[PDB]
CSV table of C-alpha atoms and ligand atoms in Angstrom, one decimal:
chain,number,residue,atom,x,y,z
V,3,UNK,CA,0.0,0.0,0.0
V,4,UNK,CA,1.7,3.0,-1.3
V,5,UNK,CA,-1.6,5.3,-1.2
V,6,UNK,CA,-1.6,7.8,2.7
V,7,UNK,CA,-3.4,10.9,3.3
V,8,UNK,CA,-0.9,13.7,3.1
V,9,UNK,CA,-1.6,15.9,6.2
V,10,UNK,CA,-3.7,13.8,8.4
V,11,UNK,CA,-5.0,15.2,11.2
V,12,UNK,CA,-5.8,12.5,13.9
V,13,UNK,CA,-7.9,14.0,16.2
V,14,UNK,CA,-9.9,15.0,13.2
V,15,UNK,CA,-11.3,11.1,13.0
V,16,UNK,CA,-12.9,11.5,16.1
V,17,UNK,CA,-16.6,9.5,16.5
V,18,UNK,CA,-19.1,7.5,15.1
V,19,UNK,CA,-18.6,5.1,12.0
V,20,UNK,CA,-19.8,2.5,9.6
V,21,UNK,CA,-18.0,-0.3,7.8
V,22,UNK,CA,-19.4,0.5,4.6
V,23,UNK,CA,-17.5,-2.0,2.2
V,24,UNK,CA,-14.9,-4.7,2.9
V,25,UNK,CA,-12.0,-6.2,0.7
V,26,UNK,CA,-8.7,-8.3,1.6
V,27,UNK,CA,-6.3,-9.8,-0.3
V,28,UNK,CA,-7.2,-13.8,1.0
V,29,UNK,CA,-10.6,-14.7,0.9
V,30,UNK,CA,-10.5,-16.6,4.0
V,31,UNK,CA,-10.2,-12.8,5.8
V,32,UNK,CA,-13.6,-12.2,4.8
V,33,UNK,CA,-15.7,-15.1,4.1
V,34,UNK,CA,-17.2,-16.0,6.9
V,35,UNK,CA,-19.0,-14.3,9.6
V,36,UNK,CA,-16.2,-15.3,11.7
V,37,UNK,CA,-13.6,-14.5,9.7
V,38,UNK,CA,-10.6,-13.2,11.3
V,39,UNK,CA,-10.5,-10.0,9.5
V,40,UNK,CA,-14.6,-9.4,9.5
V,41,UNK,CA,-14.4,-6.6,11.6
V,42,UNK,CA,-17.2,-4.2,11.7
V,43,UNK,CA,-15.9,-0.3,13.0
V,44,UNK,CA,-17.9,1.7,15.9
V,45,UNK,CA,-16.1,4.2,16.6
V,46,UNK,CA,-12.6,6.1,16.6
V,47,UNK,CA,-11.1,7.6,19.8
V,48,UNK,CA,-7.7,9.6,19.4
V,49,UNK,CA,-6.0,10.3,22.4
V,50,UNK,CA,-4.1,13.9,23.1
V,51,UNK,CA,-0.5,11.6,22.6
V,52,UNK,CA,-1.7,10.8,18.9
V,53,UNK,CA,-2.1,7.1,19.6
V,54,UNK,CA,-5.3,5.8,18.0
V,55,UNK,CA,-7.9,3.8,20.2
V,56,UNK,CA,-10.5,1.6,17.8
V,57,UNK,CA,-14.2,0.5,19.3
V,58,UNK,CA,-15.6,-2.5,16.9
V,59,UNK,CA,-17.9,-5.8,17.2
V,60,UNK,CA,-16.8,-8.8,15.6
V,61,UNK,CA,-18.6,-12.5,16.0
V,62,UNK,CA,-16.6,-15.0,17.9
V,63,UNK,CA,-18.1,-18.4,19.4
V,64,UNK,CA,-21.6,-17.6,17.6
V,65,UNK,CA,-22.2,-14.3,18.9
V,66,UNK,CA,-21.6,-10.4,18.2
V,67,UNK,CA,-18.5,-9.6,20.5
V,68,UNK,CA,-17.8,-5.7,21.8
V,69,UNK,CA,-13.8,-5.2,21.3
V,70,UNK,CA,-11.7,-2.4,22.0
V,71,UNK,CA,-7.4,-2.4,20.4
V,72,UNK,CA,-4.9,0.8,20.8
V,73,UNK,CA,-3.3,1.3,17.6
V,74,UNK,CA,0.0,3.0,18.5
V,75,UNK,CA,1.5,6.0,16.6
V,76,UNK,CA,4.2,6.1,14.2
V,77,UNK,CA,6.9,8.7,13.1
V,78,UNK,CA,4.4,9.0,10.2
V,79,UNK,CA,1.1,10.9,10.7
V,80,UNK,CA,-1.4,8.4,8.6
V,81,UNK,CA,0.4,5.2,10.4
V,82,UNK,CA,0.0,3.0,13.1
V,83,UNK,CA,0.5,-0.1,15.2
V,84,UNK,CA,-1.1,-3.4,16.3
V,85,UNK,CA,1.5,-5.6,17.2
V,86,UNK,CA,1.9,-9.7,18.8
V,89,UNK,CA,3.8,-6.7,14.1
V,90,UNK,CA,0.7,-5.1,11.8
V,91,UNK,CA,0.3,-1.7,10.3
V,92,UNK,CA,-2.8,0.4,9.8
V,93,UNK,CA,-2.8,2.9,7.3
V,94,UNK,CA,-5.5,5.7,6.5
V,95,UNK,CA,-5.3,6.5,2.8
V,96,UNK,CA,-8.1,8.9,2.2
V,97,UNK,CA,-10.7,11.1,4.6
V,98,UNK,CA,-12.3,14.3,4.3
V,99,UNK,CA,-13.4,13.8,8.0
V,100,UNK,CA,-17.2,14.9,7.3
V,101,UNK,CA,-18.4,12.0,5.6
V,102,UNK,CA,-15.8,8.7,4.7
V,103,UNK,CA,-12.8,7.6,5.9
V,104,UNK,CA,-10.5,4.1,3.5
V,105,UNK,CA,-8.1,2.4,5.9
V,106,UNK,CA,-6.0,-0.8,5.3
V,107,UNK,CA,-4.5,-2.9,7.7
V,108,UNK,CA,-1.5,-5.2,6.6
V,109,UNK,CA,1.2,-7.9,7.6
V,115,UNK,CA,1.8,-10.4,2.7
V,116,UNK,CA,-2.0,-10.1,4.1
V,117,UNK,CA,-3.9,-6.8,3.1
V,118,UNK,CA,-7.7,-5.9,4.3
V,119,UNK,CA,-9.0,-2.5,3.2
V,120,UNK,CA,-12.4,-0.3,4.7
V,121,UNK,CA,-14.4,2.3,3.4
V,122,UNK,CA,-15.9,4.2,6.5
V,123,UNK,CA,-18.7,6.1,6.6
V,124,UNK,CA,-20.4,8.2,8.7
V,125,UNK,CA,-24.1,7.4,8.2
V,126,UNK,CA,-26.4,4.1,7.5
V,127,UNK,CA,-25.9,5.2,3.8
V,128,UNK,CA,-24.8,4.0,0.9
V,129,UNK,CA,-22.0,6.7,-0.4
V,130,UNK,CA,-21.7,5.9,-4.5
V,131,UNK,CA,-18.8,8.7,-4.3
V,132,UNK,CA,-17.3,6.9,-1.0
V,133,UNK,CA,-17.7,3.2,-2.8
V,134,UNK,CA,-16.1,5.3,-6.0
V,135,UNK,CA,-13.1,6.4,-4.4
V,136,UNK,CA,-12.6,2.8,-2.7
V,137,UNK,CA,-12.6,1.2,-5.7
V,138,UNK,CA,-9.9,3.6,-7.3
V,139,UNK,CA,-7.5,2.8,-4.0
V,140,UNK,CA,-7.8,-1.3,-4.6
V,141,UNK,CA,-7.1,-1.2,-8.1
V,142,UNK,CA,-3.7,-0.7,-7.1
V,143,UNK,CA,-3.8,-3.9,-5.0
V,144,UNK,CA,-4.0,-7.6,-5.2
V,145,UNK,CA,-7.8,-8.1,-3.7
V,146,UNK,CA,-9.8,-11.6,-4.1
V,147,UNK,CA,-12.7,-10.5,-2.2
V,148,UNK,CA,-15.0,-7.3,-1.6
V,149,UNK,CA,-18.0,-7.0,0.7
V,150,UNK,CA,-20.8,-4.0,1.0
V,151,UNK,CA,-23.6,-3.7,3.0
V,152,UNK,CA,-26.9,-1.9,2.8
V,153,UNK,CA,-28.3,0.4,5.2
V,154,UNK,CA,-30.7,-1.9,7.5
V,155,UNK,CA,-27.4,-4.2,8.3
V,156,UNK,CA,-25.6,-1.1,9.4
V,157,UNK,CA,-27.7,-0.4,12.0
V,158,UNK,CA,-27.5,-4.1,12.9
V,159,UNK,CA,-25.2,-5.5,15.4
V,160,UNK,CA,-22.0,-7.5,13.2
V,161,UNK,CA,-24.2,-6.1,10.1
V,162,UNK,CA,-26.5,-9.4,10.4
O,3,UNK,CA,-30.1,-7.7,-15.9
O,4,UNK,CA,-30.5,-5.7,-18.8
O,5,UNK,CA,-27.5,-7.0,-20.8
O,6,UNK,CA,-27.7,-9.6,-23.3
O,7,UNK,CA,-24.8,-10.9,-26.2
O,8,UNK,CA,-26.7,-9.9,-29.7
O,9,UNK,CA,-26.0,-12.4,-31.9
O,10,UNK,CA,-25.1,-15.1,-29.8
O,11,UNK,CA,-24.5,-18.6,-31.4
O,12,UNK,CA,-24.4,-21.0,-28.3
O,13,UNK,CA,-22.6,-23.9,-30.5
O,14,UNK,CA,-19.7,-21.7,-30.0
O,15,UNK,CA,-19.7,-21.8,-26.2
O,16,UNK,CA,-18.9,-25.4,-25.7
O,17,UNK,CA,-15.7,-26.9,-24.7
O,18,UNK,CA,-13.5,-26.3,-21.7
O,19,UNK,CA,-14.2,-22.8,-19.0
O,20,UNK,CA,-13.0,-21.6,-15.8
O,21,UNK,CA,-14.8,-19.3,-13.4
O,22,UNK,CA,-12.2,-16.4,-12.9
O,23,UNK,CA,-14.8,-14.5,-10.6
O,24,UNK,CA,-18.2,-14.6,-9.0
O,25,UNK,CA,-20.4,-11.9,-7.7
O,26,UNK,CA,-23.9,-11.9,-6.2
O,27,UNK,CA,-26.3,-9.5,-5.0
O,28,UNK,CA,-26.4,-11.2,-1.2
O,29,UNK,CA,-23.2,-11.9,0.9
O,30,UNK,CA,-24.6,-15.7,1.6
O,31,UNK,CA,-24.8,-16.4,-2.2
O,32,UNK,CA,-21.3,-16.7,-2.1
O,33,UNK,CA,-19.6,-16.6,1.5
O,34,UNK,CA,-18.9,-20.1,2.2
O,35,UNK,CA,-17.7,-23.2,-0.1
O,36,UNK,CA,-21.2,-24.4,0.6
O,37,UNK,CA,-22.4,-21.4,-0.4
O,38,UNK,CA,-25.6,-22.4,-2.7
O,39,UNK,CA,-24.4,-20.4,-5.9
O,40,UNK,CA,-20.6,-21.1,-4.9
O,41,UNK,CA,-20.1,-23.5,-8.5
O,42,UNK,CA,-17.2,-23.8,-10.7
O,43,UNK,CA,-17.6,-24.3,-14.0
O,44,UNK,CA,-15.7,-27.0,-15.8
O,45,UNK,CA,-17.6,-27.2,-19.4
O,46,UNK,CA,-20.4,-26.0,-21.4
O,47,UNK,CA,-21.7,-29.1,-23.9
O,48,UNK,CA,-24.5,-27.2,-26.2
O,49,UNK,CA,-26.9,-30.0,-27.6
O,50,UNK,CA,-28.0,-29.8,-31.7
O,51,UNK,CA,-31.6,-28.5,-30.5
O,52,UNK,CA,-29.7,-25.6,-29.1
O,53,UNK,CA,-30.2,-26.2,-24.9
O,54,UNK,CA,-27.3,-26.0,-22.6
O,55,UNK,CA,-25.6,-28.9,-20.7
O,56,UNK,CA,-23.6,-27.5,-17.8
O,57,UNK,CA,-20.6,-29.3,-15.8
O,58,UNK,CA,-19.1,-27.7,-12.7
O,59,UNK,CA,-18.4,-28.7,-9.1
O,60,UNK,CA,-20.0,-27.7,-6.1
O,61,UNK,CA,-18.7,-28.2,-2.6
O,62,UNK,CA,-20.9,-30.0,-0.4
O,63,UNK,CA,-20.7,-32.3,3.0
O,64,UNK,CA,-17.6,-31.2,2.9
O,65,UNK,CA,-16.1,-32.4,-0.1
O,66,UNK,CA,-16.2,-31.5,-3.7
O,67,UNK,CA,-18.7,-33.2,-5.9
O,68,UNK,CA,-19.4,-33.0,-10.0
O,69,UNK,CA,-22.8,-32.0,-11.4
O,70,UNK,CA,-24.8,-31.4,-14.1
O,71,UNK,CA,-27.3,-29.4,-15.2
O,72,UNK,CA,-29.4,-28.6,-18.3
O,73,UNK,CA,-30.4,-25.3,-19.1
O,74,UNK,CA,-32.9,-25.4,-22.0
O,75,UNK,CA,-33.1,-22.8,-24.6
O,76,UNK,CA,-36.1,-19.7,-24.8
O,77,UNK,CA,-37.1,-17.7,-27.7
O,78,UNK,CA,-34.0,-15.6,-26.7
O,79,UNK,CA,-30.9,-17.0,-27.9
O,80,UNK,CA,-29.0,-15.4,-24.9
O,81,UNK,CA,-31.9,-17.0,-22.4
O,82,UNK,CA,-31.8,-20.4,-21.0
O,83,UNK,CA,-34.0,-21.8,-17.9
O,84,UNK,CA,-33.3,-24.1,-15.0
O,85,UNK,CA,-36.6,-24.5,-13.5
O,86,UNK,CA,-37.7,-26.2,-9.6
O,89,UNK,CA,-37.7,-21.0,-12.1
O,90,UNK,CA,-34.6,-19.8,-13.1
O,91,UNK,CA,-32.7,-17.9,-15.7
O,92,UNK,CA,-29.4,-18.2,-17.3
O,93,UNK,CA,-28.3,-15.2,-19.1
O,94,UNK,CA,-25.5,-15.2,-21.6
O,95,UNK,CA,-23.8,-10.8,-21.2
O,96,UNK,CA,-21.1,-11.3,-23.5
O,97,UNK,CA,-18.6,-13.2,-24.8
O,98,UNK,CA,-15.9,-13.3,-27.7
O,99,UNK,CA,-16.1,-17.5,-27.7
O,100,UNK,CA,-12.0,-17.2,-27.8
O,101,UNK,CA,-11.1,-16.0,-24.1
O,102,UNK,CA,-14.0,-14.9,-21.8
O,103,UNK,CA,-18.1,-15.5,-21.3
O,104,UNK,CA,-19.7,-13.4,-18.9
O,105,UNK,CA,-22.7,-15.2,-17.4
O,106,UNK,CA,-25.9,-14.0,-14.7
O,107,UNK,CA,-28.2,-16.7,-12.8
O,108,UNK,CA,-31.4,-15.1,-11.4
O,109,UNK,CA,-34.8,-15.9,-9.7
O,115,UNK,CA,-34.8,-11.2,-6.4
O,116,UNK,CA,-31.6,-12.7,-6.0
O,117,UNK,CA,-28.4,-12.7,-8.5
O,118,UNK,CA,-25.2,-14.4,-9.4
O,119,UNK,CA,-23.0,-13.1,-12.5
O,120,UNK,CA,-19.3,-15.1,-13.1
O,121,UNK,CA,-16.6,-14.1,-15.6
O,122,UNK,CA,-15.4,-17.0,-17.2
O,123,UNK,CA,-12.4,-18.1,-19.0
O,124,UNK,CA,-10.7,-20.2,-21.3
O,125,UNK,CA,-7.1,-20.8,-19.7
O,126,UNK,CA,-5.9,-20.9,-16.0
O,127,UNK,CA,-4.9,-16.8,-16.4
O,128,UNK,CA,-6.1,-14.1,-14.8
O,129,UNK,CA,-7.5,-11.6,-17.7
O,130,UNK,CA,-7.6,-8.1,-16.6
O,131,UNK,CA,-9.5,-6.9,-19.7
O,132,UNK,CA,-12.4,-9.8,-19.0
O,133,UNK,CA,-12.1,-8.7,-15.4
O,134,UNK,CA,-12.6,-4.9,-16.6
O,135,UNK,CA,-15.5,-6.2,-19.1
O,136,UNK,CA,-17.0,-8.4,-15.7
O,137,UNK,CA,-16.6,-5.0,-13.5
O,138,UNK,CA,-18.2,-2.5,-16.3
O,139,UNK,CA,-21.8,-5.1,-16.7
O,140,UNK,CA,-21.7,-5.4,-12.4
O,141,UNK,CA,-21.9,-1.5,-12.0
O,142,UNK,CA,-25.3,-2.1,-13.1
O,143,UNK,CA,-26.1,-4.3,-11.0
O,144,UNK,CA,-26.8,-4.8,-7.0
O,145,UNK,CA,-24.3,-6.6,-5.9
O,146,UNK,CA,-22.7,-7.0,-2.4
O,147,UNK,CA,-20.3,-9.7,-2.7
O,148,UNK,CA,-17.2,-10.7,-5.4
O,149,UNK,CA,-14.3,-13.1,-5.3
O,150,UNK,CA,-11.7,-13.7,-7.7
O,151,UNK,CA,-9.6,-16.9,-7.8
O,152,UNK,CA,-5.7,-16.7,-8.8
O,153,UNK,CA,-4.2,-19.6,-11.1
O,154,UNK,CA,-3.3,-22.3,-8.3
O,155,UNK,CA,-6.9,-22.3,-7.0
O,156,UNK,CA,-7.9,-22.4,-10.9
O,157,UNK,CA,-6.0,-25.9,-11.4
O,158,UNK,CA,-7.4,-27.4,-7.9
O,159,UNK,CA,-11.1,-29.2,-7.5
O,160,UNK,CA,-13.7,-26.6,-6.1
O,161,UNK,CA,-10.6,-23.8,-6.3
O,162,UNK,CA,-9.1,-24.8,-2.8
U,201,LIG,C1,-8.8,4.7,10.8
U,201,LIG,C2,-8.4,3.5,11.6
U,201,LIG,C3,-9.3,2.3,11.5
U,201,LIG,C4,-8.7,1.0,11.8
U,201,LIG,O1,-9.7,0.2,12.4
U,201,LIG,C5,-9.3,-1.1,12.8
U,201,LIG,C6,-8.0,-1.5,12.6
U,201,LIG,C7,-7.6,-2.8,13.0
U,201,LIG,C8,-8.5,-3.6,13.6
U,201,LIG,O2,-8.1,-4.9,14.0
U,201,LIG,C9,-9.1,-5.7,14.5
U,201,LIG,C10,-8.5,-7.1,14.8
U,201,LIG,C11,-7.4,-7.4,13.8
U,201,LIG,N1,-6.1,-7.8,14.5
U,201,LIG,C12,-6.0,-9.2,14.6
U,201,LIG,C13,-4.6,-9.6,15.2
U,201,LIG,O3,-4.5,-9.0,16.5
U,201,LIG,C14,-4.7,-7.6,16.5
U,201,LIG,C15,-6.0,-7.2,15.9
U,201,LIG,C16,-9.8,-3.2,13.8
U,201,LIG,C17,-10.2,-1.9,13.4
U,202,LIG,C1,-23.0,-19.8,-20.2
U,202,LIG,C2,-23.8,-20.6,-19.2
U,202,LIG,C3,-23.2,-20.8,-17.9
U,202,LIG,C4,-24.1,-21.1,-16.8
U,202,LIG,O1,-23.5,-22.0,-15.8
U,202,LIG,C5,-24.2,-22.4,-14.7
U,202,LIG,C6,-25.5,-21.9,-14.6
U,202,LIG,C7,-26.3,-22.3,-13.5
U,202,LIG,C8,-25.7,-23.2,-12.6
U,202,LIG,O2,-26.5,-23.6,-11.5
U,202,LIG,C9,-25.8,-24.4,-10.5
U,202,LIG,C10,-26.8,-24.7,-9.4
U,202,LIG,C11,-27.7,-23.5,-9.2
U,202,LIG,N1,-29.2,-23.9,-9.2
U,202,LIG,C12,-29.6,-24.1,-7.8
U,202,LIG,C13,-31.1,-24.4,-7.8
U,202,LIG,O3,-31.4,-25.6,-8.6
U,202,LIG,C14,-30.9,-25.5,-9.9
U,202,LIG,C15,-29.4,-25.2,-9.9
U,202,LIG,C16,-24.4,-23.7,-12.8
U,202,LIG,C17,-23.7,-23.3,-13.8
């Protein structure tokens, strides 16, 4: 991934959001409701340091699990850190409205954020034009009843 | 689906195919290998009286089993049925390389198709262009290892 947001501002990020559309490099990430990488976004809390705390569900054991990571500044403003050693990387937001994130190891899973139970065409749009550049298998979306739903059921 | 091949002659369809991609207009169409329109292509056998035998595999109690099918012919050469009713639609193809396909009852299923174990970027961009009209919330694509391997494992 060779596509950040020049000029991020973090704290900028703040709040509610929506896991609009899904896509990953395996197709194992994704398939399944339980699928490792089948994580569906809440909400984004910056801290005053810069480090990045993430509120999501995901299903685990046949049910829709609350989870809460830290993803850990970097030296670069649109980078950060989960490590047991994986990157997130914000590639596009105009902070009002959608937000395209990947995470990587080579193992690659990409979001487009949103900030409403709407489908954004020109959100899904610019998505699209950010994975062309990479080697995905499969791609997920979701209309706006299962973004209301808990783990988008 | 709105898109039909003018001038279709189905003789020119059979022999050997492999399904490059899938999409579908629900997520469960397609998430699993049990999945219920998860089905690989392996040949299309056109009779004289112009219906459509189809072989593919399909994974199922856990293992890959063969199949076939008969889709019989319409009034529209692009227009087959599979009735328990069904349609097959024929988008496009150039006989050579690539045959982009839909299944429909309302539900959908649409697959690129193709003649070698090679992943063809202009049948992918042809597959991509005749989806943007369409409703879909899942795609996979399978790389050339999983296109030589029973049920794309
Ligand atoms: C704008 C930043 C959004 C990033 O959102 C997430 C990034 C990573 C996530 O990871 C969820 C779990 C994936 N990892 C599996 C391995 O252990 C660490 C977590 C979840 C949300
Ligand atoms: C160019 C024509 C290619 C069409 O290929 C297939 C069309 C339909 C298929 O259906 C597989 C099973 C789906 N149906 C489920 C309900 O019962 C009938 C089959 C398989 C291949």
């Amino acid at each position: 991934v060779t596509q950040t947001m020049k000029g991020l501002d973090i704290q900028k990020v703040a709040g509610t959001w929506y896991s609009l559309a899904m896509a990953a490099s395996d197709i194992s990430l994704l398939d399944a409701q339980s699928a490792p990488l089948r994580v569906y976004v809440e909400e984004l809390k910056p801290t005053p340091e810069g480090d990045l705390e993430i509120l999501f569900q995901k299903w685990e054991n046949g049910e829709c699990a609350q989870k809460k990571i830290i993803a850990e500044k970097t030296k670069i403003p649109a980078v950060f850190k989960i490590d047991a050693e994986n990157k997130v990387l914000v590639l596009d937001t105009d902070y009002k409205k959608y937000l395209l994130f990947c995470m990587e190891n080579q193992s690659l899973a990409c979001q487009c954020l949103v900030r409403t139970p709407e489908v954004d065409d020109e959100a899904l749009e610019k998505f699209d034009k950010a994975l062309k550049a990479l080697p995905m298998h499969i791609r997920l979306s979701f209309n706006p009843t299962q973004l209301e739903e808990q783990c988008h059921i």
